[PDB]
Structure formats: structure tokens, C-alpha cells
A paper describes a structure:
DtpAa crystallized in the monoclinic space group P21, representing a much lower symmetry than was the case for HEWL (P43212) and making it an important test system for the general applicability of this method. Data from an additional 27 drops were added to provide a much higher quality data set (increasing the number of merged diffraction patterns to 22 854), although a total of 35 drops is not very efficient for screening if every tested crystallization condition requires 35 drops for low-symmetry space groups. More amino acids, water molecules and alternate conformations could be convincingly modelled when 35 drops were merged (22 854 merged diffraction patterns), although these were removed for the 12-drop and eight-drop data sets (10 054 and 5360 merged diffraction patterns, respectively) where the electron density was not as clear. The resolution achieved in the fixed-target experiment was 1.78 Å, while the in-plate data from 35 drops reached 1.79 Å resolution (22 854 merged diffraction patterns). In previous structures free of radiation-induced changes (measured with 10 fs XFEL pulses) the Fe—OH2 bond length has consistently been shown to be ∼2.4 Å and to progressively increase in a quasi-linear manner with accumulated dose until the water molecule is at a distance that indicates complete dissociation from the heme subsequent to reduction of iron from the ferric to the ferrous state. The observed Fe—O distances of 2.6–2.7 Å in the structures presented here are similar to those observed at doses of 75–100 kGy in experiments where a sequence of still diffraction patterns were obtained from each microcrystal in a fixed target over several tens of milliseconds, providing a fine-grained dose series. The dose delivered in this data collection from crystallization plates was approximately 18 kGy per crystal (and hence for the full data set as each crystal is assumed to be exposed only once), which is significantly lower than would be expected for the observed Fe—O bond length when compared with the SSX data. The doses calculated for in-plate data collection appeared to be lower than suggested by the electron density, although it is important to note that time regimes and sample environments differ from those in the previous fixed-target experiment.
Here, a highly sample-efficient methodology to measure serial crystallography data from microcrystals by raster scanning within standard in situ 96-well crystallization plates is described. Structures were determined from very small quantities of microcrystal suspension and the results were compared with those from other sample-delivery methods. We demonstrate that raster-scan serial data collection within crystallization plates can be an easily accessible and rapid method of assessing microcrystallization experiments and determining suitable-quality room-temperature structures.
Numbering used by the authors:
A (entry chain A): 52 to 417
B (entry chain B): 55 to 383, 385 to 417
The structure:
């Protein structure tokens, strides 16, 4: 999809995972406030109909104006005149959802609670959530409009628990395109899974019927981690230290000793605690992740410095065999000196909306 | 890759085309040493020359001595200049330092308290500001991040605000952007093409009484939160009554097209456009150059969003103050001013030997 165009909303999988990574992110986690299973199903269907309009660049409901003068417009209007901008909307269900609506026995085993990791300082207010909507678009206003209108449609049935805006991507599903840099100045996304690698996506990303939870076939599992960066500490590190931390050089992003970004890492030349060496599939029994995160900055830290961070998003076939073993291996990561995980959540991302009659979560509910 | 010339009689970023993104930072000065601060302005000017041309600051982001921290933090490598402009301004509190008290312009007036103000001290004020605008937010953020790093030990960041306007890769150029209330925003503004109106309403002139400010301007910044969820429950007629323009076309009530000149008597008496219009304010006219923001959601699940309002004018006492005073009475139901600062924005950097603030510090 070129700039401005729409990303197809229907498919066997939800868009927004293997889709090329859009420039902007608006991630919202919602808690459910209704106990009425029928009312929540009706919300899912109303949300699905809204998403069809939004991802096509159309206003929700009857439109943003022209209705009865005395009624609030159905669409809040601030995306009027804008292109779809590659908007994708990806819904996920958190483990806490399954304490409601009789869903207990339907919780996927792959939707594992994450253990505590060393160094965690998780803010419980910006963690968890019954469900999430990841809105990705090339235009921040398009992404905000989608989240705001979904929240407004859901009034009385869901409330926003927390949200995170990402001002630029730090990830790549398109190795044919330039790899974006994170706020530490390193390319981020070189060795990820590409949207064209159908076999790798089947192996590492999509849930299969044989994995034990039939309603999740074709979905995925999402781990979100809000990671603060100690940029004061990083920025006084020498160039050699920074490159040692990762195992790739800063300018080209090539593995140490090699000349080109996409040359294969030779792990034994990296320091034993180098990030790439510790996170590489070959260090983790083959565990492989689809990374899809974004940078953020939320003002200052009150101590005279810019706040900076990375909103880490990983998709995987099974949280127990993707993020958990890799993150456990990062216990000795040289990068730990410069980061702190401050928020966390996991979600089961259901399969795609197959056609115009289908709806988000229809295989769970149905 | 489009770039905006850094040098000029005026700083860029004021009359030059409005870029898609904003990173605004207010800094406090932590040194008492005038010479050290002047040294900093020169290094900052050298860095700004590099940044606005799309080059790394100093010796670069890599390829130097391995034992040294790189001069540039590296996260804009591979990106375009993205029309980056960097505009510096000096707050009233700066003039209590360095012996400058008698050089504060009278046009750099303290703002009165206005009805409904709910100003957060931590997001207000500041000894100086850097307005970084660019089409790529990572270019803007990189600029602020590196200027702050270069200044470490002499300045700290007091507060910062990210914002967005239109996305120009997808949105036509003669299309007015919409603010987060869904209304076109910017129809009746001073355009950068209007040289005469800029001279009359925006640029400080030497006759105004502060010679070092000639060719500069005065900036008012207001962080204005919108009560989004309340606004979204209002009727379309209520929303249009608040502004005096229709929501779809943005035409003044009773007219057909967005750029039809308004008939103020057809608007309700406390409609925003009627109260803000120059005809209601003795001719007072502003250059608005603000950006929307959405910082997330507050503790009650509400959208922390609004307008980071920026107004440039020849004299704060005859620009923002009389217009904001006249807004004392229908948009106020839906907004709250929660941060404020004023800055004297000096004249432009004339050439490669000149530096930010040279007319003030000599
Ligand atoms: C602020 C936090 C982080 C930063 C700045 C960061 C940065 C990087 C960089 C610069 C690379 C090399 C380029 C690339 O292949 O993408 C990389 C690779 C990688 N990272 Fe991270 N990372 C962070 C967090 C994490 C976390 C939390 C995980 C997993 C739990 C992770 C897993 C990986 C993986 C799997 C790779 C690819 C390794 C390979 O196969 O070669 N990263 N990261
Ligand atoms: C969140 C806050 C605000 C919003 C959403 C808002 C919105 C608007 C809109 C929709 C218009 C009509 C279209 C246009 O000509 O731009 C307008 C006009 C205008 N506004 Fe505001 N505004 C806000 C705050 C302010 C403030 C604080 C001031 C000055 C103190 C101001 C001064 C003006 C002026 C001078 C005009 C042009 C009036 C004319 O000459 O026709 N606005 N604004």
C-alpha cells in the first residue's frame, strides 16, 4: 500500500500485524464495564461496522454533519477530508476479559501471564486491560479520530484504561524499505519477520488449530511493553560502548565486523551480553518474534530532561514460546543499563474479519 | 527533500509555510555566567545550521573516536531536512539574568490572569523556547534532543509539547486543516504571503521602542485542553453556534463557502468567530500558528487533547491580550487554558557569522 491508500480490513488475519508498518500509533487499552454479554456482542458488531468505515476513509454512522441539527453527529468530524492513510485497527482481548461473560474455559493457554522479570517497575495503571485497539496510520489525526470514535461508540460499555501514542515507528515488516531508527539512534527492525514471509508467519506468528484453542486459529498473541530509555545515561556513553551494547555498528547497522546492515550476524564476534546476541533466535532455541513497536516521548520527566521511550509490541504464535524465553534471556543484556520496563500487557488477537457479515471476536462469542 | 533557509532578516518558522509537526520546548537557564550563555547561543546556532540542512551536529553521529560519545545522537540519520525550522525565543524571566533587566521590551508584557485560567506552573513559563517544526516528528524531536544535550549544564528542559497539524503527503496544501473539534481552523489568518500585514501586525519595528528586537516578533503559547467527550455530546447546531461557521464547509453562518467573508451580526453574540474577529477588537489581528495535541488519556479515561495555541504578533499588548480579553464570554464551555508562556522571538540570523541573540547580547 502506497501513501494515503487503504489497507483492506477483511481477511483471514487482522490487518496491522504483517501489514507494512505505518508511521504513527495510537494504542488504547479498554476495560469492560457491562456484565451483559449480549450488549457487549452488540458493541463488537457496532465497532466492526465503524472500523469498516474508518479504514476506508469514511465517517462512521450517518456521517460528520448533515444530520438532524439537534442531534450530536455520528462521527466527530476531525478526519473529514483526509485519506485512509493506511489506517489499520487491530483488536485484542486481555486475560482479564475471560473472567466475564462465561468465557473462563475459553482462555487460550498461549495467552500466558508474563512472569516478573528483573528490573521491572510496572505501573499497574498503565498495564493490563480487558481489551485493546491498536490504531496504526500514517496520519496521527486519522489514528486519533478512530480511537476517539470507537471509545465514544462504546460509552457505557467500555472505558479507556490507558493509551499510548507512538510518534514514529521503530520496527519493520518490509526489509525492502529503509529500517527506522529508535531514539538510541540505532536501526531497529533489521532482522524481523517480513509480511511476505508467509512460511515464517505461519510458524512464528499465527495461531494454528492444532495449538489447542480453535477460536484463535488465524489470530496471534500480543505483548506490549512500555520501555523508558535513560537517554541521559546513554548519551554520555561512548560510541564503542553503544555499539558493544547491541553488537551492530551505529551508522550502517551492520553486525560487528561486517559491512552491510543485512549481512547475517556472526554471534561469536559480539560481546556475550550484546543485545542482538542474546535476542537472536539461535540463542533462544529458535524463538522468533514479530516486533512492531514505536517510539514515544511524553513531555519531560520533571527533572530537566526529555522523557523518551519505546512502546515495544511483539506478535507471536504463543507467548510462552516467543516473548517469554527471549525476554528471560535478556536478563544479562547490556541494554538493561539504559532501559526500564514500566508498563506491560498481553492480549489474544483474534482471527481476521472474514467478510462484511463477520465481526470482531465472532469466533469467541459465536 | 525540502528545506527552509535558516538565515534571513527574520527567523524562519513564523511566516514560512506551516510544517506538519511540532516539538516545542521551553528551557530554563541554570548558569549565571553571561559569557557561558553567549557561548551556548553560538554553539546552538552552529547546531541549528546543521540540523535545518539535514546534517548531524558537530562531527556527526558515528565515525569519530570510539572512546568518545558521538556529537549527534543519531536518530535522524537517513532522514530528510523535512522543512525543519528552529525558532528561539526569550522569556521575561531571562531578563532578570545577565544584567538584561533594562532591555526587556515593553511589548513583552506579562499576561493578565484570564477568566477560567487553570494554568499548570510546571507547563508554563520558561527562560527560553525553541520551536522545532518539521514534516517528520523524529526530525523535530532529534533537534530538541540534541540542542538540550548540547546545553546540558547550562540549560534544562522545563516543559515540552509535541503537536501535529495536517499530513502533507496525503492532504492538499490549500485545504484548511481541522482541529480536534472537527472544525476547519486557520481560514482567516495572516498568511505568510502577506508582506504588508506581517509588517503591520507581526514584526517588531525599530520605532516600537526596542531596537534589538527589530525584525523579531512576540510569541504567546497557550496549552488549551479540549473537553472532548463533552463536546462530542453537543448537537451539531450547538457546535456550529459556538463558532459561527458550519462544520462541513466552514462557511460563516448564512454564507455558502469557507472563504466568504463573515457577517458578524448573523452569528450569535458570543460565538467564537464574532468575538475573535479584528472588527470586534479594534482591528487587532494575530498570526496563529498552533498545532493540535493528543498526549494520551488522563486518570478518568478522558482524552488529553486540545490545541497548542501559538500566536505571533508585533506587540502582546495589542495582539493576543485584547482578543483573549474579548473571549471572556461560548467555546469556553469546552476548553480550558492549562499552560501559558510568552517569548520575545529575536530577529533572524543574517549570515554564517551571526548567531541567535546577537542583537541582544552584542
Ligand atoms: C528500548 C528497548 C529496545 C531497543 C532500543 C532495542 C533495539 C534493538 C536493535 C537496535 C536491534 C538490532 C536491529 C534489529 O535486528 O532489529 C534489535 C534486535 C532485536 N531485538 Fe531489540 N530492542 C529493545 C527491546 C527488545 C525486547 C524487549 C525484545 C524481546 C523481548 C527484543 C528482541 C529483539 C530481537 C528478537 C531482535 C532481533 C535479533 C536478531 O534476530 O538478530 N528487543 N533490538
Ligand atoms: C482550543 C481553542 C480554540 C479553537 C478550537 C479555535 C477555533 C477556531 C476556529 C474553528 C476558527 C474559525 C476558522 C478560522 O478563521 O480559523 C477560529 C478563528 C479565530 N480564532 Fe480561534 N480557536 C481557539 C482559540 C483561540 C484563541 C485562544 C484565540 C486568541 C486569543 C483565537 C483567535 C481566533 C481568531 C483571531 C480567529 C479568526 C477570526 C476572524 O478573523 O474571522 N482562537 N478559531
Amino acid at each position: 500500500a502506497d501513501a494515503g491508500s487503504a489497507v483492506p480490513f477483511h481477511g483471514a488475519h487482522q490487518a496491522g500485524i504483517a501489514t507494512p508498518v505505518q508511521d504513527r500509533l495510537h494504542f488504547a487499552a479498554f476495560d469492560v464495564t457491562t456484565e451483559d454479554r449480549a450488549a457487549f456482542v452488540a458493541l463488537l458488531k457496532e465497532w466492526t461496522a465503524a472500523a469498516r468505515r474508518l479504514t476506508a476513509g469514511h465517517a462512521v454512522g450517518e456521517g460528520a454533519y448533515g444530520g438532524l441539527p439537534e442531534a450530536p453527529p455520528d462521527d466527530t468530524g476531525e478526519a473529514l477530508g483526509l485519506k485512509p492513510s493506511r489506517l489499520t485497527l487491530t483488536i485484542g482481548f486481555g486475560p482479564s476479559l475471560f473472567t466475564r461473560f462465561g468465557l473462563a474455559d475459553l482462555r487460550p493457554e498461549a495467552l500466558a501471564d508474563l512472569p516478573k522479570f528483573p528490573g521491572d517497575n510496572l505501573d499497574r495503571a498503565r498495564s493490563g486491560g480487558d481489551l485493546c485497539v491498536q490504531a496504526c496510520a500514517d496520519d496521527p489525526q486519522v489514528a486519533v479520530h478512530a480511537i476517539r470514535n470507537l471509545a465514544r461508540i462504546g460509552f457505557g460499555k467500555v472505558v479507556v484504561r490507558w493509551s499510548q501514542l507512538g510518534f514514529g515507528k521503530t520496527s519493520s515488516t518490509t526489509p525492502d524499505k529503509q529500517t527506522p531508527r529508535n531514539l538510541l539512534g540505532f536501526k531497529d527492525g533489521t532482522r524481523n519477520i517480513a509480511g511476505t514471509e508467509k512460511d515464517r508467519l505461519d510458524r512464528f506468528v499465527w495461531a494454528a488449530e492444532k495449538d489447542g484453542t480453535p477460536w484463535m486459529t488465524g489470530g496471534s498473541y500480543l505483548v506490549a511493553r512500555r520501555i523508558r530509555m535513560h537517554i541521559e545515561t546513554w548519551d554520555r556513553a561512548s560510541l564503542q560502548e553503544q555499539e558493544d551494547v547491541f553488537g551492530r555498528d551505529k551508522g550502517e547497522g551492520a553486525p560487528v565486523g561486517k559491512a552491510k546492515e543485512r549481512d547475517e550476524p556472526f554471534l561469536k564476534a559480539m560481546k556475550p551480553d550484546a543485545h542482538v546476541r542474546l535476542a537472536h533466535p539461535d540463542s533462544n532455541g529458535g524463538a522468533t518474534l514479530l516486533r512492531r513497536g514505536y517510539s514515544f516521548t511524553d513531555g519531560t520527566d520533571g527533572l530537566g530532561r526529555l522523557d523518551a521511550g519505546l512502546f515495544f509490541l511483539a506478535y507471536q504464535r504463543d507467548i510462552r514460546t516467543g516473548f517469554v524465553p527471549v525476554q528471560r534471556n535478556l536478563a544479562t543484556d547490556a541494554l538493561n543499563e539504559f532501559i526500564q520496563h514500566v508498563g506491560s500487557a498481553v492480549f489474544a488477537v483474534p482471527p481476521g474479519v472474514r467478510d462484511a457479515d463477520d465481526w470482531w471476536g465472532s469466533t469467541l462469542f459465536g
